[PDB]
Write a protein that holds these residues in place. Sequence first.
Motif, PDB file in Angstrom:
ATOM      1  N   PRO A 143       9.015  23.808 -48.952  1.00 54.47           N
ATOM      2  CA  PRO A 143       8.624  24.343 -47.916  1.00 54.47           C
ATOM      3  C   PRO A 143       7.435  23.513 -47.210  1.00 54.47           C
ATOM      4  N   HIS A 144       6.456  22.739 -47.969  1.00 53.99           N
ATOM      5  CA  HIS A 144       5.687  21.886 -47.399  1.00 53.99           C
ATOM      6  C   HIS A 144       6.378  20.842 -46.719  1.00 53.99           C
ATOM      7  N   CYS A 145       7.648  20.421 -46.957  1.00 53.21           N
ATOM      8  CA  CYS A 145       8.366  19.344 -46.338  1.00 53.21           C
ATOM      9  C   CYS A 145       8.763  19.916 -44.931  1.00 53.21           C
ATOM     10  N   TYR A 146       9.287  21.086 -44.743  1.00 56.37           N
ATOM     11  CA  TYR A 146       9.576  21.786 -43.519  1.00 56.37           C
ATOM     12  C   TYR A 146       8.094  21.669 -42.603  1.00 56.37           C
ATOM     13  N   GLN A 147       7.196  21.922 -43.089  1.00 51.42           N
ATOM     14  CA  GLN A 147       6.294  21.845 -42.362  1.00 51.42           C
ATOM     15  C   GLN A 147       5.685  20.248 -41.951  1.00 51.42           C
ATOM     16  N   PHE A 148       5.932  19.475 -42.855  1.00 46.71           N
ATOM     17  CA  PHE A 148       5.680  18.041 -42.715  1.00 46.71           C
ATOM     18  C   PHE A 148       6.665  17.264 -41.425  1.00 46.71           C
ATOM     19  N   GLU A 149       7.916  17.935 -41.599  1.00 44.11           N
ATOM     20  CA  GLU A 149       8.896  17.423 -40.794  1.00 44.11           C
ATOM     21  C   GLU A 149       8.987  18.302 -39.246  1.00 44.11           C
ATOM     22  N   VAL A 180       7.134  20.722 -38.192  1.00 44.13           N
ATOM     23  CA  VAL A 180       5.621  21.196 -37.552  1.00 44.13           C
ATOM     24  C   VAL A 180       4.798  20.131 -37.247  1.00 44.13           C
ATOM     25  N   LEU A 181       4.717  19.148 -38.210  1.00 44.08           N
ATOM     26  CA  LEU A 181       3.458  17.992 -38.096  1.00 44.08           C
ATOM     27  C   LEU A 181       4.298  16.748 -37.627  1.00 44.08           C
ATOM     28  N   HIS A 182       5.824  16.678 -38.135  1.00 43.36           N
ATOM     29  CA  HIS A 182       6.279  15.435 -37.596  1.00 43.36           C
ATOM     30  C   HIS A 182       5.740  14.185 -38.386  1.00 43.36           C
ATOM     31  N   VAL A 213       7.501  17.138 -54.094  1.00 45.39           N
ATOM     32  CA  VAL A 213       7.666  16.778 -52.709  1.00 45.39           C
ATOM     33  C   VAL A 213       6.944  17.597 -51.934  1.00 45.39           C
ATOM     34  N   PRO A 214       6.557  16.969 -50.546  1.00 42.86           N
ATOM     35  CA  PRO A 214       6.633  15.870 -49.894  1.00 42.86           C
ATOM     36  C   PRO A 214       5.833  14.770 -50.592  1.00 42.86           C
ATOM     37  N   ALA A 215       6.314  13.500 -50.480  1.00 42.41           N
ATOM     38  CA  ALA A 215       5.780  12.329 -50.941  1.00 42.41           C
ATOM     39  C   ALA A 215       5.956  11.092 -50.216  1.00 42.41           C
ATOM     40  N   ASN A 239      -2.092  10.377 -50.625  1.00 44.16           N
ATOM     41  CA  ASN A 239      -2.627  11.713 -51.002  1.00 44.16           C
ATOM     42  C   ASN A 239      -3.399  12.771 -49.972  1.00 44.16           C
ATOM     43  N   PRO A 240      -2.235  13.399 -49.299  1.00 43.29           N
ATOM     44  CA  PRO A 240      -2.732  14.394 -48.332  1.00 43.29           C
ATOM     45  C   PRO A 240      -4.036  15.378 -48.638  1.00 43.29           C
ATOM     46  N   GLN A 241      -3.939  15.597 -50.017  1.00 37.64           N
ATOM     47  CA  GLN A 241      -5.021  16.521 -50.394  1.00 37.64           C
ATOM     48  C   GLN A 241      -6.476  16.190 -50.169  1.00 37.64           C
ATOM     49  N   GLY A 242      -6.561  14.766 -49.910  1.00 34.67           N
ATOM     50  CA  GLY A 242      -7.783  14.145 -49.390  1.00 34.67           C
ATOM     51  C   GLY A 242      -7.975  13.965 -47.778  1.00 34.67           C
ATOM     52  N   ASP A 268      -8.521  16.585 -44.001  1.00 37.18           N
ATOM     53  CA  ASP A 268      -8.932  17.936 -43.350  1.00 37.18           C
ATOM     54  C   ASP A 268      -7.615  18.582 -42.579  1.00 37.18           C
ATOM     55  N   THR A 269      -7.480  19.970 -42.790  1.00 37.25           N
ATOM     56  CA  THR A 269      -6.443  20.646 -42.356  1.00 37.25           C
ATOM     57  C   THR A 269      -6.770  21.641 -41.423  1.00 37.25           C
ATOM     58  N   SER A 270      -8.064  21.373 -40.858  1.00 35.33           N
ATOM     59  CA  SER A 270      -8.506  22.561 -39.657  1.00 35.33           C
ATOM     60  C   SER A 270      -7.380  22.395 -38.262  1.00 35.33           C
ATOM     61  N   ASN A 271      -7.164  20.887 -38.393  1.00 32.69           N
ATOM     62  CA  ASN A 271      -6.691  20.564 -37.089  1.00 32.69           C
ATOM     63  C   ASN A 271      -5.334  19.769 -37.652  1.00 32.69           C
ATOM     64  N   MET A 272      -4.166  20.241 -37.022  1.00 29.65           N
ATOM     65  CA  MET A 272      -2.979  19.696 -37.660  1.00 29.65           C
ATOM     66  C   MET A 272      -2.906  18.308 -36.948  1.00 29.65           C
ATOM     67  N   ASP A 273      -3.252  17.977 -35.667  1.00 25.91           N
ATOM     68  CA  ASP A 273      -2.894  16.707 -35.157  1.00 25.91           C
ATOM     69  C   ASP A 273      -3.827  15.608 -35.908  1.00 25.91           C
ATOM     70  N   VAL A 274      -4.986  15.932 -36.135  1.00 22.34           N
ATOM     71  CA  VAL A 274      -5.948  15.085 -36.935  1.00 22.34           C
ATOM     72  C   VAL A 274      -5.345  14.640 -38.136  1.00 22.34           C
ATOM     73  N   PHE A 275      -5.055  15.724 -38.864  1.00 27.41           N
ATOM     74  CA  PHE A 275      -4.358  15.529 -40.245  1.00 27.41           C
ATOM     75  C   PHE A 275      -3.252  14.349 -40.353  1.00 27.41           C
ATOM     76  N   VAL A 276      -2.513  14.659 -39.041  1.00 29.31           N
ATOM     77  CA  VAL A 276      -1.269  13.741 -38.844  1.00 29.31           C
ATOM     78  C   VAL A 276      -1.648  12.393 -38.879  1.00 29.31           C
TER      79      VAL A 276
HETATM   80  C1  LIG Z   1       2.062  18.578 -49.868  1.00 25.20           C
HETATM   81  N1  LIG Z   1       1.440  19.321 -48.706  1.00 25.20           N
HETATM   82  C2  LIG Z   1       0.472  18.669 -48.071  1.00 25.20           C
HETATM   83  C3  LIG Z   1      -0.475  18.997 -47.157  1.00 25.20           C
HETATM   84  C4  LIG Z   1      -1.660  18.830 -47.054  1.00 25.20           C
HETATM   85  C5  LIG Z   1      -2.623  19.270 -46.111  1.00 25.20           C
HETATM   86  C6  LIG Z   1      -2.167  20.074 -45.010  1.00 25.20           C
HETATM   87  C7  LIG Z   1      -0.673  20.457 -44.877  1.00 25.20           C
HETATM   88  C8  LIG Z   1      -0.159  21.380 -43.874  1.00 25.20           C
HETATM   89  C9  LIG Z   1      -0.840  21.638 -42.657  1.00 25.20           C
HETATM   90  C10 LIG Z   1      -0.100  22.475 -41.711  1.00 25.20           C
HETATM   91  S1  LIG Z   1       1.092  22.688 -42.342  1.00 25.20           S
HETATM   92  C11 LIG Z   1       0.874  22.069 -43.972  1.00 25.20           C
HETATM   93  C12 LIG Z   1       0.030  20.038 -45.880  1.00 25.20           C
END
Ligand SMILES: CNCc1cccc(-c2ccsc2)c1
Length: 188
Positions: free
Chosen positions: A31-37, A39-41, A150-152, A162-165, A167-175
């Motif tokens: 599920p996180h890989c679906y998001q990564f690819e 939604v977040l690309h 995964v994802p990794a 290490n994506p856990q470090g 911010d995820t308030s904004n998708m584009d910034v995270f990416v």
């Molecule tokens: C392994 N999942 C990592 C991760 C870290 C931070 C944000 C997301 C995310 C943010 C919108 S969809 C998925 C995923």
Amino acid sequence: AQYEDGKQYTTLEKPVAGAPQVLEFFSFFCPHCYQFEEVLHISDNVKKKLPEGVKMTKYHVNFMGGDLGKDLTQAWAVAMALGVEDKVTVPLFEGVQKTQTIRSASDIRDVFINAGIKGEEYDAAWNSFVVKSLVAQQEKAAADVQLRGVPAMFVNGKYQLNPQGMDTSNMDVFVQQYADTVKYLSEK
Ligand SMILES: CNCc1cccc(-c2ccsc2)c1
């Protein structure tokens, strides 16, 4: 101290010799890989920011989804062998996780047929030893780093994203943070 080991990335205690420069792992079951690819690309924005001469490799993994997960690793080998990754990545993710119409190896095959890959072509590839070799390459790469989530993404067999470090308030910034970290590591 903007980038630091333990924060945006970790450092492999057993560095992997001869590994791809940028190596991404995923599962169509993930599920996180679906998001990564979808939604977040992530792959695309990372690739978009790699220095010249830096190749990107993306491999499927077995450890999710049991029998079907193994079929998907073989189908990804087919996708790589034929060079149709950009044609099947979306409908494979949606078939497994959105419509849940992918339940068998035949359902996976349907996705390639619908994307315009000829039946004969898919089947010859599916059954080929070139594809068996690509399956083995994917398994070996994952094995080299004791991969269990995964994802990794790994850079030069030495650093692990290490994506856990981030911010995820904004998708584009995270990416962009993720992509700039990969770039930083690749220059490291
Ligand atoms: C392994 N999942 C990592 C991760 C870290 C931070 C944000 C997301 C995310 C943010 C919108 S969809 C998925 C995923």
